[PDB]
Design a protein around this motif. Structure first.
Motif, PDB file in Angstrom:
ATOM      1  N   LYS A   1      38.670  37.565  38.397  1.00  0.00           N
ATOM      2  CA  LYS A   1      38.956  36.661  37.286  1.00  0.00           C
ATOM      3  C   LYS A   1      39.075  37.242  36.270  1.00  0.00           C
ATOM      4  O   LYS A   1      38.885  36.698  35.093  1.00  0.00           O
ATOM      5  CB  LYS A   1      37.452  35.848  37.223  1.00  0.00           C
ATOM      6  CG  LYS A   1      36.949  35.219  38.472  1.00  0.00           C
ATOM      7  CD  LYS A   1      35.566  34.087  38.349  1.00  0.00           C
ATOM      8  CE  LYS A   1      35.794  33.193  37.270  1.00  0.00           C
ATOM      9  NZ  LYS A   1      34.399  32.354  36.913  1.00  0.00           N
TER      10      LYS A   1
ATOM     11  N   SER B   1      42.329  39.031  40.462  1.00  0.00           N
ATOM     12  CA  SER B   1      42.202  37.711  39.876  1.00  0.00           C
ATOM     13  C   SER B   1      42.404  36.699  40.980  1.00  0.00           C
ATOM     14  O   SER B   1      43.753  36.296  41.075  1.00  0.00           O
ATOM     15  CB  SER B   1      42.906  37.547  38.449  1.00  0.00           C
ATOM     16  OG  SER B   1      42.650  36.187  38.136  1.00  0.00           O
TER      17      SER B   1
ATOM     18  N   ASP C   1      41.832  36.845  34.876  1.00  0.00           N
ATOM     19  CA  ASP C   1      42.717  35.955  34.486  1.00  0.00           C
ATOM     20  C   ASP C   1      42.065  35.614  32.965  1.00  0.00           C
ATOM     21  O   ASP C   1      42.950  35.102  32.046  1.00  0.00           O
ATOM     22  CB  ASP C   1      42.676  34.755  35.458  1.00  0.00           C
ATOM     23  CG  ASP C   1      41.394  34.108  35.922  1.00  0.00           C
ATOM     24  OD1 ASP C   1      40.558  33.869  35.039  1.00  0.00           O
ATOM     25  OD2 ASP C   1      41.251  34.339  37.088  1.00  0.00           O
TER      26      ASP C   1
ATOM     27  N   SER D   1      44.439  33.624  40.073  1.00  0.00           N
ATOM     28  CA  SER D   1      46.111  33.900  39.870  1.00  0.00           C
ATOM     29  C   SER D   1      46.593  34.528  41.046  1.00  0.00           C
ATOM     30  O   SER D   1      47.731  34.728  41.182  1.00  0.00           O
ATOM     31  CB  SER D   1      46.104  34.616  38.608  1.00  0.00           C
ATOM     32  OG  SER D   1      45.381  35.999  38.898  1.00  0.00           O
TER      33      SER D   1
ATOM     34  N   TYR E   1      46.094  37.422  41.635  1.00  0.00           N
ATOM     35  CA  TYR E   1      46.498  38.947  41.094  1.00  0.00           C
ATOM     36  C   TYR E   1      46.028  39.992  41.944  1.00  0.00           C
ATOM     37  O   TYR E   1      44.584  39.960  42.191  1.00  0.00           O
ATOM     38  CB  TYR E   1      45.932  38.877  39.571  1.00  0.00           C
ATOM     39  CG  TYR E   1      46.294  40.251  39.094  1.00  0.00           C
ATOM     40  CD1 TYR E   1      47.415  40.598  38.721  1.00  0.00           C
ATOM     41  CD2 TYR E   1      45.183  41.136  38.692  1.00  0.00           C
ATOM     42  CE1 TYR E   1      47.824  42.036  38.082  1.00  0.00           C
ATOM     43  CE2 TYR E   1      45.532  42.474  38.040  1.00  0.00           C
ATOM     44  CZ  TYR E   1      46.761  42.875  37.847  1.00  0.00           C
ATOM     45  OH  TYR E   1      46.973  43.955  37.065  1.00  0.00           O
TER      46      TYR E   1
ATOM     47  N   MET F   1      49.158  34.874  36.334  1.00  0.00           N
ATOM     48  CA  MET F   1      48.620  35.737  35.436  1.00  0.00           C
ATOM     49  C   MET F   1      49.971  36.210  34.417  1.00  0.00           C
ATOM     50  O   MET F   1      51.292  36.347  35.056  1.00  0.00           O
ATOM     51  CB  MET F   1      48.491  37.086  36.299  1.00  0.00           C
ATOM     52  CG  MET F   1      48.072  38.166  35.268  1.00  0.00           C
ATOM     53  SD  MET F   1      46.626  37.742  34.496  1.00  0.00           S
ATOM     54  CE  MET F   1      45.198  37.622  35.765  1.00  0.00           C
TER      55      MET F   1
END
Length: 216
Positions: A123, A150, A125, A153, A155, A189
Motif C-alpha cells: 500500500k 502496492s 500507493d 496499483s 506495483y 502508481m
C-alpha cells in the motif's frame, strides 16, 4: 526443477498479514488464480494457484488465503502447515501492522522451519508512508529481504514471487520470461513517486550502518 520431464512444480505459498494490508487484493490481481480458485473447508482457507513463467519453466504457487481468519485473530497451525513458501505483508501506513509482522513471523516459524520467508510492505500507493526504511529493522534482524509492493496499483506484483522462486530453486539468475494475465490495477502508481521510493531505499541500503537503524 533442474531435471526435466518432471510434473509442473507447485509450491504451497502461505500469505500472512493483517486486515487492510491488501494481501487478498494482491491475489485478486492474478487472473489464473481467480479462474482456478479452489476452497478448502477443513482449513477454512481459499486456494489460488498462481502460475509464473520462468526461465526454468512455469512455476505454480499454490496460494493459501485464510477466509477472514486473520481478522478474527491468530491463524490455526493447519494454515501454516506445509508452508513451502511464505510471504508476510505489512501496511506501510500502519505501524501497528508492522509491529504485528514479528508476531506472524513467530507463528509461521513455530509451525514450519527452513522455509523461505518474503517480507513486503504494501500500500505504498499512499503517500503517507509512516513505516520507512529507517524504521524497517525487523527484516535485517531476521536476515529476511524487504520488498516494496502496492497491490492497489499492482506495483511490484512479480517482485516477491520472482525472489521467492529464486530462493526456492537457488537460482539467482532466474527471470520471469513470460507474465501471467493480470487484472487491471485499481490505481496507477506515479512513476516519480515510485522512483523516489526506490532511490530512498537504495540510499538507506548504501548508508554505512550495521543496520537500517542503530536500534540496539
Amino acid at each position: 526443477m533442474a531435471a526435466q520431464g518432471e510434473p509442473q512444480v507447485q509450491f504451497k505459498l502461505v500469505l500472512v498479514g493483517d486486515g487492510g494490508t491488501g494481501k487478498t487484493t494482491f491475489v485478486k490481481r492474478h487472473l489464473t488464480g481467480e479462474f482456478e480458485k479452489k476452497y478448502v473447508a477443513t482449513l477454512g482457507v481459499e486456494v489460488h494457484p498462481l502460475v509464473f513463467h520462468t526461465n526454468r519453466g512455469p512455476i505454480k504457487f499454490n496460494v493459501w488465503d485464510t477466509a477472514g481468519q486473520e481478522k478474527f485473530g491468530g491463524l490455526r497451525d493447519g494454515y501454516y502447515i506445509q508452508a513451502q513458501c511464505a510471504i508476510i505483508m505489512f501496511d506501510v501506513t500502519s505501524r501497528v501492522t508492522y509491529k504485528n509482522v514479528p508476531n506472524w513471523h513467530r507463528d509461521l516459524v513455530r509451525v514450519c522451519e527452513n522455509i523461505p520467508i518474503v517480507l513486503c510492505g504494501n500500500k505504498v500507493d499512499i503517500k503517507d508512508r509512516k513505516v520507512k526504511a529507517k524504521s524497517i529493522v525487523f527484516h535485517r534482524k531476521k536476515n529476511l529481504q524487504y520488498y516494496d509492493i502496492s497491490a492497489k496499483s499492482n506495483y511490484n506484483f512479480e517482485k516477491p514471487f520472482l525472489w521467492l522462486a529464486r530462493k526456492l530453486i537457488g537460482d539467482p539468475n532466474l527471470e520471469f520470461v513470460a507474465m501471467p494475465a493480470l487484472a487491471p490495477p485499481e490505481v496507477v502508481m506515479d512513476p516519480a513517486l515510485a522512483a523516489q521510493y526506490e532511490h530512498d531505499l537504495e540510499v538507506a541500503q548504501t548508508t554505512a550502518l550495521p543496520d537500517e537503524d542503530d536500534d540496539l
